[PDB]
Structures are given as structure tokens and as C-alpha cells.
Design a protein around this nucleic acid. Structure first.
Lengths: 319, 323, 319, 323
DNA sequence: ATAACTCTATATAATGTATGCTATATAGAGTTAT
DNA sequence: ATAACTCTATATAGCATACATTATATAGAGTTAT
DNA sequence: ATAACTCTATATAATGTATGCTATATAGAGTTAT
DNA sequence: ATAACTCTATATAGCATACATTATATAGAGTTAT
């Protein structure tokens, strides 16, 4: 009823933890937005009315947001409802159709979802060629990060979760990094990302100069202050937002300061080395089956996307 | 209800830009046929009754229609009812059954999916020969075309839609063309196809002869009248009707009038150039992904269907039996 | 009700054709059996009672039939019911559990589903080495069949459905056989099984001596009478039961007449060359992905089964 | 109802041979624990209430139990209710939720699946050395064992269950053993594993010393008492308890008493021989399928989990970074 | 003062897609025969 | 008149957006040991 | 007489696992300007 | 007495049978052109 609904919602909040803190962050961000819009037009924000949700989506469209943004607003609203034991706004032709229409109209006007600026072996080689020589702590760290990012393809959050006790050895002396939870998998088995001899060195230097190994329950990566003194912690990771500045900083280092356009992907970012490595692998002739393991994907499309725009023909009509 | 339904058809019309022009055309076409048959056979067309749709699908098969076409028919009907809030005819055991049956019955009668007749290099050379040395404007134009289609495996629309603010001039006596063979948001924005001494050149003549490059906002391909005079347009493109024309027209020149009974793909169609493009590209074995380059393919049964009759694709068993 | 039930059944019978004639054959064979058992014990055969179906299954078990036999009886009964709009006997713990128990008890006593005696390149080579020389029509045919069976892996029914107009050429002059419906697929696209140069020859000789090509709508394979005169037909195929005797005959030819045991798979049979070729491919080092296309499978288990019982270890403890 | 349910538990008992002894043991074990907790915390154990099972699973996690063990618990409870006609606790949003949460919470605390400590060749040689030259019956017996397990990657049961009407003598100063590592109907009936100069021989001594071959219906492995006298049996096999014994016992001899806190896999277990078998077989890189030969594996995450820390399996990225 | 973060909120890209029956590990308690 | 189209309609071949969440992108405001 | 099937019934092995929106093909009818 | 087990119970790792049909296996009875 309304009792049942307050119970499904409240059962949700109880095991809040069954979902990513980001799901919550986005659930509440979308609700603010919606509730905001509803207040202005004197509309009931919950349960939501298809016709009202439809005006909202068009309003987002008109605000010039990305089809993916709009779909996120719709998905959170749909989650709120479904998880409530109620009908999903998408369950109404007003909402189903306006979404298709918005997408269709936006792409039939251009719009394509972006993907981070690639970070390939060449970029790694040059950056390393340049920082290798630094005795600074921040650099030793940053170079090890970029090394692990490109070598393993792990995502910011996976990397920031690596604690000292997750590192091992192959025999040949290559560092093995064991991975627990990922965006695609939360299991006890898990993975073991192995590092090349070169990258191992890089990582070994960081461990040394930093003293993180001091507590095996310490996170591999930590802050390093203006004074160059690291700041190990077994309780607080280096912030996702920091692991990403490393990418932007490094890029600033080589290519200088970025546009004033305000666009996205003017410099490398957290996904830069995933895109870049995936690719490098294709060129090398790595097997899709293999390119996919590298990235931990269980499917073929992202992988496909990261590869796109040879000349077999011209080379065929000049006999 | 009649009100739940009325609100539902109003939603459909309000957000009609939620489907392609084409989809709507097919929906309209199917309803017109279902409706005519329902009149003829004294039944109600909306809402659709399972037994009736079953009667119609058998009527369609008896009409000697393809399994894929009987699908589109149920398909659109299923959509109409879904988008109006009524039951889908497919959600009925009678319809689910008969469709099943019909498909088995038909494949067992020789139902043959068709695909385009390859316009491969042998064909490009031969035709290149006949029209190579001709002065006729429309003859020069049609050469370029068969060049941009074979050399580029580009889709019709993307050659029609083409402008000459999309045409560069790369690597030394060679052109290059910026395009867009996508419409997927999470896809590509466009690309850049190149041209050999084969194409590129041919396209030059069409540049001299057609006078095209005067308002470079100008589509590279235009219409050539009976006088052999060409009419540019930064506002109109050659219908996809015409470009399929150049393919059949050109097949006739070499092979004559039509041929065997009203078949489907008796001559070259808008797709022939890509078909033959790949086979030639496969015959010298180039690599599938490089093959999917010229194309834009992301599936395979589409490239592999085009690849099948070749000796290169015979399979492991032949390879084993022969040492 | 009972009306609804007579309507679902009768709707079934109408589009009888949506299922294999074998499904029907087996539906009715299982029903005879059941109805038979029910009459003896004075039981209502329909709707079936879980407790009654349970006694039936044990009775089959006691009759010494194979777990697969018993499961077939259960599946047909389940189909009858489900398709009737009624509960499936398997929907009752009495039936669900007795089935597990029967399987469990039968396998915990031995029982393993068989697979036909293999027919590999060696067997093909020897048989061909021997028949090659025959100017008889039956042999020319039979050798072409065995050739196509091993080359294509097609199943009896697929082979018996090949009409003359389904054969083509690669360019290199290899025969291409286009396949419509299979046990695993009923589509208009379909397949094109290609033949080796050697097998093509074999097939070409049969076509010649037989005059099947006389009507392109003729079935590639037909009877050949004691007098050696073939008997082409565009309406009647060579019987599945005949296409299989070819396998048993050929085996009788080389190894003589079979046991008196009454077992199954004493000689080659319709599936002999599928099993055999799959294997030959493994040995050659063919890629599973490829071994699977050969057989038209969309999965990996049958394929796996056809390969089983090297010595990497002994070869590892003799350093 | 209480009658629908009574009929349902009667069905369970009547066809109890529909599950393994083991499954029943686990079911019984789980209910005993769920029942005790329900008493303690004043709740009803049958039928299970969602909130209560939710309370119990949190109790189990707080018990510092593994995610895989909390699963078995819900799992058996889910089965009980399914086989009695009641709702499954998993079919509840509360239970579906908390289980989800617990798994994320635990993996994020370092939940580490465990696997066996490899008993590889270095270990077989070293131990071979220590016990090589010993006269002790039980010492000779334990050598053979570690031989049949490493050389054959055979399961415990299949070495216990083994007879000596299953043991041949192939290729010249080598033995061969017929077995059965399947139980799948649509699977294998059995196989034949061979032995090197390593094993085979060792097994000989156990043949001389143990006096085994007197009633060849005789299991190859028997018990060796404090007097060092061996007791054959064509009727009893060495418990799987004992064979895991020889593994730990033998790890202690080399490495001493137990070690670090009550962990799980601190010493060698019944699985160690297969683990190390594969790694050694992978280290000289043999081929996965040939690897799955010695084993019987049909999955991989089981072989590959055993393969992971090796340099051979490092992956494409390392291979690229290093030229 | 400030470098180097943290946090936090809106914006937008990226991805799998699921169990349940049966074995083993293991520490203890129970049993034989030495 | 017709070549040379464009529009149409019905026929069929060739693709690719809708779930449910979980994650990253980025600018800007707040925090802390130097 | 009979070889070589067909048929038919019981027995038992073998296998995928699914659409719906959007483009093209095509023959005709309609339109311009030559 | 204890070595050497076997039994147990609770803990966890490693697998693999339940749908819905569609097909082949095989002996034996009936069919037909020679």
C-alpha cells in the first residue's frame, strides 16, 4: 500500500550496502534534481507520474545534457520505483517513447559518447623516459601508478584498493597484484594482475622511498606532501580524484596546460591507459580472447569500441 | 480500455520521432494489408484476435511470401498492440505455433535468403573498359560512382549525402573522403576513406565534366539529364533510387535485359560493390578486422555470408582431407 | 477447465507441424506406454497423478531401461501436461526426486550413455581404398555418402534432405552443399557444407552413374536396385534407416558380421563419422572454435565428449 | 499446508537416495545450527521467516564465517523450504539484499578463497630422499602414495577405492592402472593411468613389504599399525581421513609442527599433489587439454587458479612491455 | 602561505547479464590392536 | 515524347538500442602539515 | 525368389537456450526539363 | 598407554545434473521391381 512502499524503501536503506556508494550518490543526486523540478511546477515527486517524468526528461534535454545523463536520471527514478514495489516510469509509453525520441534526436544531431584520451606504450615510454630520473617521491609514486595503470588496466578504484599484503612474486621476481572487487566482479576468488620486470622495479622503488610496506594492511598508494614525505594509511586510500589528477598532471607535464574549451578528455584521465593498452594489444596482434582477459571484460563491445579510426583496398586497386 | 488505448495512440503520435520514417512506413503498410484482409474476410482489425492473425499469416505464406516478411507483419502488429496497451498476437499459443510451423514448412520448400550479386574487380575492370574511353557525362559520372562504392564499400546514403567539403586530397595524386557510417551515440562520429589511381582519377573527370566544384557545399553526385548536362545541388541528393539504378543499369549494358523470372537480385544492386569488395579483399586474404574496416561491420554472418562460396573459407575438414 | 484443456491440446494438434514428426512419434510412443501401464493398475492416464507417474518411472527402471529412456517418458508426459495448460508431473517432488534417484542409482551402478563407434580418416581411407575400384552403383553411392558424412559431419536426415539444386562450386571446383534445416537450426540463411576435391570427385561419380541431376529438385541420394539401376525422386528421400545401414554394411564389409551380444554400437552408425571427424580434428590440432563450426554446434560439451580415453607425467618424471 | 508439508517431507524421506550422503549431512548440519540459533534468539525455525534468516546470516558473518559458507547455509535452508513447499528465504528482498551486502563487505575485508599448497616435484624429490632409503613399512607405503597422487593427479577416493585387479604392468618396467574418475552417465566409464620408474617401482616395494597381493581383490592401500605390520582388505578402504593424513604428516616431517594460527591449508592436503602436478606440467608448458588429461577437469579457474602465480601465465601486457 | 590533497556535487561513460548439489579440509572424538 | 528522375508501396536483408547498476570526469570548496 | 529397400515401433543419444527496429530492393507511378 | 586409525561435525572448495525438444539405433514386418 503506502505501508508496503515505506517498507520496501526502508528495507532498501537497511542493506544500503548491497549497492555501490556511487549508486546511492547518483540515486540521491537524481532525486534532488527531480524533486527540484517538481517543486517549481508544483508536482508530486513521488510516486512519479509518467507525464511528469516525461516533461522532466525533455527539460534535461533542453538543459543540453547528454543522452547518458538523461538516461541516468530515468534509471534512478526507475530504480526508486521498482525497488519500491511500484511501476517503473519507463513502464509507460510516455516515458519509454520520449527517451527513444530524445536519444534519436540527439544522435541525429551528432552526439556520441566520448572515451578518454588514450595512454599507450609510447606515452608510457616517454613519460617514464622523463620521470625515471626524478628522485622526488611524488614522481616515483606517480610513475609507478602510471606503470600499474597501463600494465594492469585496472580502474582508479581498483588501484586505490591495492593494500601491501596483496602483492606477491612469480619466481622470476615479477610482482603479482591480487584483485578483489571490480566494477564487474565481487568474489573471493578474484584475480592476480602481474607486473612486468620493468614495472615491478618502478613499483619496488615507490614502496622503498615511501615506507608503505611498514604495515602490510596499508594501501599501496598514499599522499606525499610538499615536503616529499609520504603518508601511509591502512584506513584511508588515496582519493580517486587524486589518482586521476596524476593522469592530468602527467599530461600537463608533457603537452602543457589544456584548452579553455571546457570540453572533456583534453588530457589523459583514469580510463586513459585502459583504452590505450586495449588498443596497443590489438596492434600487436593480441587475440581478442586475450585482449579481453587483460581488461577483465566478459564481453566484446567496449573492447571493440576502443578500436576504430589501414587501406587494404587502395592497396588492392594498384595491382 | 478504449480510453487507455486512446491515451496510448496519442502518446504514439506525440513521440512519433521515436522511430524512423521507415519504421512508420512499414507499420502503416502492414496495417493497411491486415486491415484490407480483415474486411475481405469479415473480421475485426483492432484489436487483433489470435485466430484471425493466424488466418492472416497462413494467407501470407500462401501468398508465397517469405518467412522474414511474415515476421515483419506479425512484428508490426505486435508493436501496434504493445504500444496501444493490448495483447501481442505473438503472446498467443496459436500464433506462436503457426509461425513456428510456417518457418519449418517454408525452409523445407527451399526458402532461400538472398543477398547481393557481387560486383567484384573483374566487373569493375570490364565495365571500366567499356566506359573508360567514353565522352558521355552520365557515363563519366557512373564510373566515379562504381569507384567510390567498390573502392570504399560505402553505403548508398553516405555517397548520396556526400558533399565536396567532405573531399580532401591526400598522399600524392590520390583523394581522401571524410564521412559518417554510424548513428549509434556510443559509436563513431565519422571516418576518412582514400582513393586509388582507379577511383580518385575517375572522380576527377566527374569534377571537370560535371562542373560540380562551384559552390563547394556541393554534393559530389548529381543528376545528368537527357542533354547530358549536370545539375549541382547543395540542397538535394540523388535518391537512393537512382544509385541502385546505376547498378542495374550498368549490369544491363553488359548482360542485357532482365533475365530469369521476377526473382530479386538478378542484376547488380546498391550492395553489390561491397559484396565483391570483401571477396576480392578476402581472396588475397587480408584479415577479417581489416575487412570490417572498409565496411563498418560489427557482426559476422553478414561478412561471412559474403565470404562462404570462396575456396579460402572451405573449412578445416577440407584442409584435413587434402593433407 | 476441461474445455480450456481440450482447446490447448487441440490447438497443439492443429499446428502439429511446429514440432518434429519425431517429437510426435515419441509423444505418442510414451503415451501408449503410459496408458498401457495405467490400464493394468486401473489408473487414470490423464491428467496424470504424480504418485502414478512415479510408479511408472520406477517400473521403467525395473524394466531395465536407460536413464535417458526414462527421462524421455517423463519429458513427453511433462510436455503433454505443460502444453495442456496444466501442471507438469516433474512439478511434484514425488516425480522430481524419483528421477534424480533413478539416475543417481543407475549411474552409481555403472550406466553411461553411449556414443557411436567412431569413423575416422583411417577408416575412410581404407574403405575408399577398397570401394574406389567398384563399378557397382550401390558402392559408388555408398562411398560418396561415407565421403560426405565424414567430410561434412551432417546427420543422416540432413544428408537425406540434400536435393541436387543445393550443390554448387567454389571456383577451385569443390562442391558446395547448402544446408537448410538441422537438429539445431531452422533458418533461410543456413549453411553451405563444402567438399574436398577428393570427395567432390566421389560425389561427381555418383551423380553421373545415377542420373539424379536429371531433376534439380531431386534428392541427391536414392535407392539403387539389385539390378544396379538407381531410382531418383524429387518426392521421396532415401530412408533414414537406409542411410544408416550403409554404415553398418560398410563395417560388415571390413570387420565381418557383428557380435551376438545384442549391444549397441558394435558397428559404425549414422553418428559414427561425426564423432570420428570431430576427433580427427582435435588431433590435427584444430581450434575448438573451429572443431565446433565443422559440426555446426553452438556449444562445447558434445564436442568435449567425443574426446577422452598422452602421458605428460611419466614423461615428466624421467627428467 | 501442514498436510501439504507433511506429504512433502515424506516424499523427501522416501526418495532420500536422490541426494548424496554428503548433501544430507550438510542439510542436517545447517538445520541443527539454524535451529539452535532460533531457540537462543527466541524465533521459529520452520517455517523460516525472512527477517530471522537475515538475522542469522549476519550472525554467521559476525561469526567470522566465509561468504561461501554463509551461502551453503542459506542454500540448504532454501532447499528445505523448496522441498517442503514453503517459500525460499532467498526469494525475499531482505535476504537477497543482506547476502549481497555481506559478500561485498567481506571481499572488502580481504576474503581470500583458499586452495591447496602445491606438492610439486621439488617436494617429491626431497621427501623421496628422506624416506627413499628407509626400511619402515609405513614409510614405504607413504612413498608409493605420494607417487600415485603426483604421478596420477588422481582423487583421494579413487586411490582408496583402488584394488589390485585394477593394476596392470605395461611398457617395460612400468605399471598401468585402470580407474574411474567420473560419475556422470554422459561421461566416462573409466581410464588407464601409467607409472614411471619413480612411482611404479616405489609401488613394487609396497607390494613386497606390504604383502598386499595375496587375495587380488585386494585394495592396493591398507593400514600400517604401530608394529609396522600391514592389514589387507578387499572389504575396507583407507578413510579419506588417513590419506589427507599422509599429506600433512609428511609436511610436518620436513617443516615441523603446525605453524601460523589455525588457518586452512598451512600444510599439504589431499589436493596438493594435483596442484603441484599441473604447475610442474605447466612450467615445462605441456598444453591445457593434456593438462586436463592427468586431472579430469572440464572447467578452468580450477586449473587456471592453480596456474596463476607462474611466470608462464603472466599475460599479454607483460609480454608486450618486455618487447 | 601553500602544495597536495579531500570532499562533494553535477555530469557522463562502462558493463555483467546466477546456482545448488557434492566433494574436501580439518580438528576432534571414538576404536583396535599393539 | 522520353530520358532521367523522384515518390511509393510492398518485399525482404541487415543490423543495434532497452536493463540495472557501478564507475569515472571535472571544477570547485574545504583541510592539513608543513 | 530376392536384393534392397520402407516402415514402424520401442529404445536412447544429442543439443539450443530469441527480436524488433531500420535499412535496402524493386517495380511502378508521378514529375521536370529537354 | 599410544600409534594408527575411523567417525563426526562444521567449514569451505569444486564441481555438473534439470528443460524442452529433436534426433539417431536397431530389429523386424511389409513392399517392389526385377
Amino acid at each position: 500500500t503506502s505501508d508496503e512502499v515505506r517498507k520496501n524503501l526502508m528495507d532498501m536503506f537497511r542493506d544500503r550496502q548491497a549497492f555501490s556508494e556511487h549508486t546511492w550518490k547518483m540515486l540521491l543526486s537524481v532525486c534532488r534534481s527531480w524533486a527540484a523540478w517538481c517543486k517549481l511546477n508544483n508536482r508530486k515527486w513521488f510516486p512519479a507520474e509518467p507525464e511528469d517524468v516525461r516533461d522532466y526528461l525533455l527539460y534535461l534535454q533542453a538543459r543540453g545534457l547528454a543522452v547518458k545523463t538523461i538516461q541516468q536520471h530515468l534509471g534512478q527514478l526507475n530504480m526508486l520505483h521498482r525497488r519500491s514495489g511500484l511501476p517503473r516510469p519507463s513502464d509507460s509509453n510516455a516515458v519509454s517513447l520520449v527517451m527513444r525520441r530524445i536519444r534519436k534526436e540527439n544522435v541525429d544531431a551528432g552526439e556520441r559518447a566520448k572515451q578518454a584520451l588514450a595512454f599507450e606504450r609510447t606515452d608510457f615510454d616517454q613519460v617514464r623516459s622523463l620521470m625515471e630520473n626524478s628522485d622526488r617521491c611524488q614522481d616515483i609514486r606517480n610513475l609507478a601508478f602510471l606503470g600499474i595503470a597501463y600494465n594492469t588496466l585496472l580502474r582508479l578504484a581498483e588501484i586505490a584498493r591495492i593494500r601491501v599484503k596483496d602483492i606477491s612474486r612469480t619466481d622470476g621476481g615479477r610482482m603479482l597484484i591480487h584483485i578483489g572487487r571490480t566494477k564487474t566482479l565481487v568474489s573471493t576468488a578474484g584475480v592476480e594482475k602481474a607486473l612486468s620486470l620493468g614495472v615491478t622495479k618502478l613499483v619496488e622503488r615507490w614502496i622503498s622511498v615511501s615506507g608503505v610496506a611498514d604495515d602490510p594492511n596499508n594501501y599501496l598508494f598514499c599522499r606525499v606532501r610538499k615536503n616529499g614525505v609520504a603518508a601511509p594509511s591502512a584506513t584511508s586510500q588515496l582519493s580517486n580524484s587524486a589518482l586521476g589528477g596524476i593522469f592530468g598532471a602527467t599530461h600537463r607535464l608533457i603537452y602543457g596546460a589544456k584548452d579553455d574549451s571546457g570540453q572533456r578528455y583534453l588530457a589523459w584521465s583514469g580510463h586513459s591507459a585502459r583504452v590505450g593498452a586495449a588498443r596497443d594489444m590489438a596492434r600487436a596482434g593480441v587475440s581478442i580472447p586475450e585482449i579481453m582477459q587483460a581488461g577483465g571484460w566478459t564481453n566484446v563491445n567496449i573492447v571493440m569500441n576502443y578500436i576504430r579510426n589501414t587501406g587494404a583496398m587502395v592497396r588492392l586497386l594498384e595491382d
